[PDB]
Structure formats: C-alpha cells, structure tokens
C-alpha cells in the first residue's frame, strides 16, 4: 500500500517505455523488463509511474507495490549493479575468474567451476574474494548465493563460501 | 506530541522563559553527544552559573507555539536537532558569541547570531550585542567616549556598534 | 552424595531410600569436572530378573571409571554386606573396576580421626566417614586425587608482560598451581595439567614460553 502508491519517478538519464503490461527500460547500461503485470495498471507519464489496483484483484497493492519495487529496483539497475563481496575463507581455499566461468577450490578432487549467465561479470582482488557486478538486482545476488551453494560454510571454523559479510553460527561442542 | 501536560509545561517553559529571556540564542545540532549538553551544562553550569538554558523537542509545529513573536527569527528552530538555548539576566549577550567562537564541532555555533528576544535578526552578524556588555572598547579606544553616557555613546561607536 | 554434591537427594531409614540414577558434576584436583551418579541401595539376595531389567540403570555403573563404595559403621553386618554387595557386582560385570571403600558412619564409633588410609600405594582404600557429618571428606577427595591421573610432571611456567593470556588459559581450563608475579612483568607460575591440555595448548598457543610440552 505504502510504497505501492508512492510514485516511482523516472530519472532523466534513464528512459522508461511502457508497452502493454510490461515496460521496457532502456538505461545507463541496463535495458530490460523483469516486470510483468497481471493486474495493476502501472503507467508512465512525465516520469510518473502510475499504480493502484486496476479492476478487482485483491492482489492489488500487493502485486502493484511489488511492481514498483521491481521497476524501481530495475531502473536503479539500468543505472548500475549490485551484489558483491562473495567471500571465501579458510586454508587451502581459492578462487579465480575466466571469461564467465569461475574457479573455486574446496578440497574437492574435481576443480570447482560454474559459468555466469550474462548481465553480470566478476573479479578477483584475491583468490579469497570474488566481486560480482550485474545489471539487474535480482539475478545477481541470487546466483551469487547460488555460487555460494556449493559449500555452505562450516560452523566449526567457518570454512565454506560465505555470502557477503554474514556473521554465522559458531559453536564449539564435542571438540577436544 | 508527547503526553498533554508535558507539552503544556513545555510551552509554559518557553513563554515564562520568554519573559525571562535576557537574550535568546539558537543552535542547530547533529552529532548530539551527551558532552554537548554537559559542555553547555558547564557553560550554563558553575563556570558562570545558570544564564543560558537548553531545550529539545523543537518543531515548526512546536517552537512557534512558544512565542508571541512566533516564527520570527524562530522559524529556524524546528528542523533537525535544535538544542535551543536562551540566555538569562546578567547575560545580555554572554553565551551568544560564545557559540561561534567555540564553534568547530558542528555544534556550538552562533549560526551568524540568532537572538530573537531583542536582536530581531538572523543570518546577519549580531556580535554587536556581544560587542556591548563591555568597557575596554569604551574606556580606551575612544578615550572614554562611551562610558560617559548614551549622549557620547551616541556620538561614538558608529564604527563600533551601530550607534 | 548430598554433602559431596551440595545437591538435593533425600535420605531416610527406609529401604529404597534412593531410586533413579542421579547425575551431578563435582570438582577434582586433576580433572576438575567429575561426573556423579547415585545407584539404588542393595539387599541380600536381590531378585534375579530385577537385575536383568535393571541393567539399563546400572549401565552407567559398568563404564564407570571408579567404584566408590560406602559401607556402614554400626552394623555387625559389615562383612556380610560387602559379601552381599560383591554378589551382585559379579553378575553385572565391571567388578574389575578399582574401588574405594569408605567406612562411613564413623560418628557412632569414633573409629578414628578421619584420615588417609592407603591400603597400599594402590589405594583401594578404606575411608573414615560419617556422611551426615561427612567430616571425613577432604581425605576422600585427596586420596581420590591420588587415584585418578597420569601426568604430574608439573611445570613452572613464566612470562614477561604477555601473561594475561597465560593466567587466562590457566583459569580458563584448569589451574595455575601458583601465581607469582615478578620483576618487569616477567612472571613465574606453576601449573599441573593432564597432557591433552599440554598439546592443545602447545598447538594453539605459540608456547615458546615452553615449560609445558
């Protein structure tokens, strides 16, 4: 409700473009439409991004406010990127970049690799760290943790990829 | 805002102090360390006693409630932290230039002098009232052409204090 | 069990004065923590199938590293009861365990002042108690302190102003035996720990302080 009726406002560098329920969003480097809109009659004007429930839906401000939050996320996306500091730590571990494939080293016999779908790239300030950079705010962090997914860090020394900084459980029971 | 009586006694504090106001003074704040108040609580504490006093809860929908002068040189009170500070008799302008001369730390500042009760001015220098309350600019620089009555004080200090 | 534990375990003339095993930890000079669990009291010729059902409850006794054994001092029944107890001990294994007799109830007898009573250097010792007074305890614990260990090569540790961490570890785990600060922050100490400590310590800490191994 709140933000759901809060206008989005379109920044001048960014170029919003309504087309049916969806809205193409050309921008500083982004240019897409995560959004799809079942119900809310969202609409452009000066920059004015209309919302409020259209017919009857009950999903009204739910979906609508969701839509704002999306495109509003999206336009900020077509500005620039997001999720970062996808760190890994503990002895013997390391990581690397190439092309779009990402190296990782986790005590496994087979080397750890997965290749990014585009719209995002990465870097290696160290093998200890992979920094990410993606045009659209969802997929970047999702896949980022999906990059973490191969090794949810272990409680007893924190080994395992740790998504962002993220203090975790740290017990010391049944040791020596 | 708070409970009724609290706001009420607050406004009473404002007005009864308005009649008390030997010289109002205003300062926007931000970092808000406790030492702030304590510093003034020594500025208004035993270093020279009470003769200035601190208040918060300060709004455009609060501060104007407090004076017949109302928002005049007082509308400035409201936004952000406002440890609004009125000086008290025996202090015609003591602790009014002190703010900007102890100024450094984004707090304790004259804001180009913001007295209401008397100065009726803002964002214009009003060190004049501080520039009064004095003898040395009256007794030596003008060779006693100010301490010898308003009549020569009128005839001097056109270059010193708008008279 | 009461006095040693400062815990709530009721006692009265009646048989079955206790039921249910009961855990509470206690101090010891050489392992600090020390788990306790009271067993039900015995009789002559306790039922067969009882035990067979009762192996669960005594399943704690088996593993138990030491069979402390209180005995009465008022009854002429003395010998017999031991012979009574030995009986069931046989059938439930672990009568191979080292034991420690306590001729409890010294009050009535004024048998002796409570004392150490090295049966030998081995110590399956008699111990001089009257538990309701429990006056005999310190000898019980001390004798015990002799009876369970395996590394008393003590060391006199020391450091220069870098010991807050030492005092740390020592209070943290077991004990400094003695804390004596001395000149320019050089500080000497004495400590006695079981060896697993010695290596967890020698590993984790730089231990170039090297008095402990």
């Amino acid at each position: 409700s709140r933000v759901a009726k809060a206008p989005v406002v379109v920044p001048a560098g960014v170029d919003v473009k309504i087309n049916g329920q969806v809205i193409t969003i050309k921008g500083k480097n982004g240019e897409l439409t995560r959004t799809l809109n079942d119900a809310v009659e969202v609409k452009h004007a000066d920059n004015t991004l209309t919302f409020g429930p259209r017919d009857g839906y009950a999903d009204g401000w739910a979906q609508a406010g969701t839509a704002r939050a999306l495109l509003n996320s999206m336009v900020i996306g077509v500005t620039e990127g997001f999720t970062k500091k996808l760190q890994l730590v503990g002895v013997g571990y390391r990581a690397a970049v190439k092309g779009n494939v990402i190296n990782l080293s986790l005590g496994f016999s087979h080397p750890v690799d997965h290749q990014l779908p585009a719209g995002i790239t990465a870097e290696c300030p160290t093998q200890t760290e992979i920094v990410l950079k993606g045009a659209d705010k969802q997929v970047i962090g999702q896949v980022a943790a999906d990059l973490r997914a191969y090794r949810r860090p272990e409680p007893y020394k924190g080994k395992g990829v740790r998504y962002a900084d993220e203090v975790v459980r740290t017990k010391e029971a049944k040791k020596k | 805002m708070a409970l009724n009586l609290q706001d009420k006694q607050a406004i009473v504090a404002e007005v009864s102090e308005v009649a008390k106001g030997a010289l109002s003074a205003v300062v926007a704040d931000s970092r808000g360390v406790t030492v702030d108040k304590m510093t003034e609580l020594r500025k208004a504490g035993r270093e020279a006693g009470v003769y200035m006093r601190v208040v918060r809860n300060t709004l455009l929908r609060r501060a104007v409630e407090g004076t017949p002068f109302e928002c005049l040189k007082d509308a400035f009170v409201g936004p952000t932290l406002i440890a609004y500070s009125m000086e008290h008799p025996g202090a015609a302008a003591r602790l009014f230039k002190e703010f900007a001369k102890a100024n450094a730390k984004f707090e304790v500042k004259a804001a180009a002098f913001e007295g209401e009760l008397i100065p009726a001015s803002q964002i214009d220098r009003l060190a004049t009232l501080p520039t009064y309350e004095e003898a040395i600019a009256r007794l030596m620089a003008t060779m006693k052409e100010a301490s010898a009555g308003k009549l020569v004080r009128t005839l001097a200090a056109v270059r010193d204090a708008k008279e | 069990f009461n006095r040693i534990t400062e815990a709530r375990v009721y006692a009265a003339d009646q048989l079955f004065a206790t039921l249910d095993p009961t855990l509470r930890r206690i101090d010891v000079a050489d392992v600090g923590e020390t788990v306790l669990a009271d067993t039900v009291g015995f009789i002559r010729h306790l039922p067969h199938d009882l035990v067979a059902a009762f192996k669960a409850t005594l399943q704690e006794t088996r593993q138990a590293t030491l069979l402390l054994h209180v005995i009465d001092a008022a009854d002429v029944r003395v010998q017999e009861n031991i012979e009574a107890v030995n009986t069931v001990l046989e059938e439930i294994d672990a009568h191979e365990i080292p034991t420690l007799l306590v001729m409890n109830k010294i009050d009535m007898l004024e048998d002796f002042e409570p004392r150490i009573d090295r049966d030998e250097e081995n110590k399956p010792n008699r111990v001089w108690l009257s538990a309701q007074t429990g006056a005999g305890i310190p000898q019980l614990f001390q004798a015990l302190t002799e009876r369970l260990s395996g590394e008393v090569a003590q060391h006199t540790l020391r450091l220069p102003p870098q010991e807050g961490r030492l005092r740390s570890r020592f209070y943290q785990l077991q004990a400094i035996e003695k804390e004596w600060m001395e000149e320019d922050g050089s500080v000497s100490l004495q400590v006695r720990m079981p060896i697993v400590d010695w290596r967890r310590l020698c590993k984790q800490e730089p231990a170039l302080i090297d008095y402990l191994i």
Binding site: - | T34, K37, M38, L41, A44, G45, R46, V50 | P161, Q162, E163, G164, R165, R167, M181, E182, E183, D184, G185, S186, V187
Partner: protein, 141 residues
C-alpha cells in the same frame, strides 16, 4: 558502558606497578611501554598522594603515546579512604559497617566536580550520595 577494545583508562595505583596488573598485558594490550610511562606515572606520583590508586586516561597516537592523563580518585573510593573500612558490605545499604559525615561528601563534590553532569554542587554531592548509600556506609552530615 561498552565492552570490547578502545582507549584505555587504567586504574593504576600510585608508586611502582610495572608488572601485569595495571600496565602489563593490561597496558601491553595496546603495545604501550612500561618504563617511561611508569616513569611518567611515577613522576606524577609526586602530586597525587603517594601510593594512591587512580584511573588514568592514556593519550595515544598512531605510535601509541606515552602521555598519561590524571583523574580524580572515585568518590566511593574516597569513602573507602574515609571510613577506613577494609571491606564494603556484601549487601550495601542493606548490609553496613560504619558511617561518614557529609562534609567529606562536600569535599568530594569539590573534587569530583571534574566528573559531574550535575547542574549544582549539591546535585554533585548527591551523586556522591548515590555512591555513599551505595557502599553500605551510613550517611550523615
């Protein structure tokens, strides 16, 4: 207040104390020198009555300055140094041991004025009351 590292006020006793408890791992926890500081401290044991326990606020730079800053001994400490009790009650206010006259407390606000938010000396002395009662020492004028 707060409890993980920052600047180190240290409740140092006057006179020598080079080993651990005030300046060892205590003050060595910022890598601070023992000597010259204790010399700086011992040089300041002159004015403060000798042997008196006393908090000190260290100045440190990037290099961790040797500069010390003197503080008044605490009012409760002033009381324990007044009534002369070796040992405060285990239930202060409830348990008690002796008493102390207010004039002492007046002298106390007189020196603790350096550490009072109170807008008045009486309020200060009353913060000295907030420790006075609080030690279990009986309060009187």
């Amino acid at each position: 207040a707060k409890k993980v590292q920052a600047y180190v006020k240290l409740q140092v006793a006057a006179g020598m104390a080079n080993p651990s408890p005030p300046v060892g791992p205590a003050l060595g926890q910022q890598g601070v020198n023992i000597m010259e500081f204790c010399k700086a401290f011992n040089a300041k044991t002159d004015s403060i009555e000798k042997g008196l326990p006393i908090p000190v606020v260290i100045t440190v730079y990037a290099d961790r300055s040797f500069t010390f800053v003197t503080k008044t001994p605490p009012a409760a400490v002033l009381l324990k140094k007044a009534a002369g009790i070796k040992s405060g009650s285990g239930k202060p206010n409830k348990d008690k041991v002796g008493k102390i006259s207010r004039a002492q407390l007046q002298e106390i606000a007189q020196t603790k004025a350096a550490d009072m938010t109170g807008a008045d000396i009486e309020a200060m002395t009353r913060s000295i009351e907030g420790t006075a009662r609080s030690m279990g020492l009986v309060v009187e004028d």
